[PDB]
Amino acid sequence: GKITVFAAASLTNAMQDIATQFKKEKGVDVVSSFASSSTLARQIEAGAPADLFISADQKWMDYAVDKKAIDTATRQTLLGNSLVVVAPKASVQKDFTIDSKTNWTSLLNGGRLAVGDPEHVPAGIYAKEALQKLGAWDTLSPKLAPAEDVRGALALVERNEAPLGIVYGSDAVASKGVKVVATFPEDSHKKVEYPVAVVEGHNNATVKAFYDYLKGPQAAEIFKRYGFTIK
């Protein structure tokens, strides 16, 4: 048959490679839809026919679980990731540390900070939480350049439309146009975690085969190569 996966935008490259490999190995077609985890969870709630859902945070998975849209026995934390600051490849921006006394204003220089919409995109929620903990939020809120998902924020930095952007470590690995210039301290935000679960009513042998494949060695190889930490 055919499997439909709704996955956080940050999983774009890894998921495409995994789907290709699975088709080679088992002969089944895997179609993925990528967007902010918030958007995907609301689509699942509305009745969009996805078989699997992989969120970039626990929050949006919990959301789908409460709407009775998830086969809960299948929910499991699959990946981890880091939160970093990127700049265009050709920027002269040098590495810097992120602490209570980081001067964001001079780093930006009249430019904007690209972020996933902190209102609902997981990347933006982790970022806001970190900037609030570090006391820089009040200063940065008027300087944001929000985007539809983390890849939208990444694109702004790649196209040199924003000097700095907050994305996942994995996004930097997949991007040929940016470079990591700082890494958020692990204690500044909730641990970045990706839960996976089968959508309610879609737990059949074909979907289960792919779900098991995601926790296997071939998939772990691809995830590691793209910068994700395997939980």
Swiss-Prot record:
Protein localization: Periplasm
Entry's Gene Ontology cellular component terms: ATP-binding cassette (ABC) transporter complex, substrate-binding subunit-containing; membrane; outer membrane-bounded periplasmic space
Cited SUPFAM superfamilies: Periplasmic binding protein-like II
Phenotype of the disrupted gene, per the record: Cells are unable to transport molybdate unless high levels of it is supplied in the culture medium.
Induction cue: Expression is up-regulated by molybdate limitation. Repressed by molybdate-bound ModE.
Sequence positions that bind molybdate: 10, 37, 123, 150, 168
Reported biotechnological use: May be useful in radiopharmaceutical applications as an engineered disulfide bond-containing protein with increased affinity for perrhenate. May be used to remove chromate, which is toxic to many biological systems, from environmental aqueous solutions.
CDD domains noted in UniProt: PBP2_EcModA
GO biological process, one term: molybdate ion transport
Pfam families per UniProt: SBP_bac_11
InterPro entries to which the protein is assigned, alphabetical: ModA (IPR005950), ModA/WtpA (IPR050682)
Keyword vocabulary terms for this entry: Chromate resistance, Metal-binding, Molybdenum, Periplasm, Signal, Transport, Tungsten
A molecular function GO annotation: molybdenum ion binding
Superkingdom, taxonomy of origin: Bacteria
PANTHER family per the UniProt record, alphabetical: MOLYBDATE-BINDING PERIPLASMIC PROTEIN, MOLYBDATE-BINDING PROTEIN MODA
Similarity comment text for this entry: Belongs to the bacterial solute-binding protein ModA family.
Quaternary assembly: The complex is composed of two ATP-binding proteins (ModC), two transmembrane proteins (ModB) and a solute-binding protein (ModA).
NCBIfam families: modA, PRK10677.1
Function (record text): Part of the ABC transporter complex ModABC involved in the transport of molybdenum into the cell. Binds molybdate with high affinity in vitro and with a similar affinity in vivo. Binds tungstate with high affinity in vitro. Binds unnatural anion perrhenate with high affinity in vitro. Does not bind sulfate, phosphate, arsenate, selenate, chlorate, metavanadate, nitrate, perchlorate, permanganate or carbonate.
Name assigned to this protein: Molybdate-binding protein ModA
Organism: Escherichia coli (strain K12)
Source organism phylogeny: Bacteria, Pseudomonadati, Pseudomonadota, Gammaproteobacteria, Enterobacterales
